[PDB]
Write a protein that binds this ligand. Structure first.
Ligand code: HEC
Ligand code: HEC
Ligand SMILES: [Zn+2]
Ligand SMILES: [Zn+2]
Lengths: 136, 136
């Protein structure tokens, strides 16, 4: 029933990045520089193949500092994790949703079985609940 | 004599990212969202080892569009490449410096054998000419 902490995700494929700045509707709690990572199984799904059980996507969210017309990464705020298990996470579209505060395995954030996460991700049903697109 | 195009660099380790906004001293030509990638050999140097011959670092630069105070990755502008070969690149401190317009192998940007690149990177001689630091 629990999403595994995605040990070693910093060695995984970098899918894409985005910066959410003050004034954006999602500044709270998604504000900062985020990086999306995918393990090999998730890469199969992002390429237009199917997502095998065991696919993991990670949303890696950093605070940032303004430094003379540069935005510089600061401390990690949190990670979001989607873990594919069609049977075990069938209540939330076959993905398990978990958050880890400061990316620490000891700071699990999700309290409602990931119904809140899935409420937003459900909009992407046609791409298996994944917003991110693979780019070059 | 020429830096090899780093084929498959998008599958390499994501070191870090930074945004260089308009007004930054380096807006021309490095403005945009950049991601730094390291092959296995370059990771040896970033961890505190000597950079071995064959280490490659890539500066992957994207334009961005500001949309409701989100910075959204646009088209790739260029990649910058540092290729370690203590002997073949001795004139520029044992790194060969190249750029590829739009990340395309036939769009070589460096016209001065990398003396301008080396002139700035020489500030980091004590870190073997590399600015980026490994983060977790
Ligand atoms: C809308 C308000 C969302 C809620 C609530 C949650 N997420 Fe989300 N997520 C959202 C967007 C718009 C994106 C794409 C970001 C980008 O750069 O394009 C994401 C992405 C993720 C990812 C990466 C995979 C993907 O779908 O692109 C993960 C791993 C992820 N989100 C997890 C996640 C979790 C665990 C949430 C509840 C704690 C959660 N998200 C909520 C939009 C929204
Ligand atoms: C100072 C005026 C610079 C010039 C000219 C060039 N580079 Fe550079 N480079 C600079 C900085 C401050 C950084 C770090 C960015 C960060 O996010 O911290 C970089 C980075 C690179 C990298 C990545 C490895 C590293 O040293 O951090 C590469 C591969 C790189 N630069 C290549 C490069 C090339 C090919 C240049 C001439 C075309 C070049 N740089 C010029 C600063 C400066
Ligand atoms: Zn200014
Ligand atoms: Zn703005």
């Amino acid at each position: 029933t629990k999403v595994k902490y995605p040990d070693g995700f910093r060695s995984w494929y970098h899918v894409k990045s985005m910066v959410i700045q003050p004034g954006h509707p999602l500044e709270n709690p998604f504000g900062g520089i985020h990086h999306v990572y995918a393990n090999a199984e998730a890469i199969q799904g992002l390429r237009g193949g199917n997502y095998p059980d065991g696919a993991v996507l990670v949303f890696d969210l950093f605070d940032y500092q303004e430094d003379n017309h540069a935005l510089v990464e600061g401390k990690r705020k949190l990670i979001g994790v989607m873990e594919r298990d069609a049977k075990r996470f069938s209540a939330t579209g076959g993905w398990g949703y978990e958050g880890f505060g400061e990316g620490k395995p000891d700071k699990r954030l999700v309290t409602d079985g990931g119904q809140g996460c899935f409420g937003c991700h459900a909009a992407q049903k046609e791409s298996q609940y994944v917003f991110s697109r693979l780019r070059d």
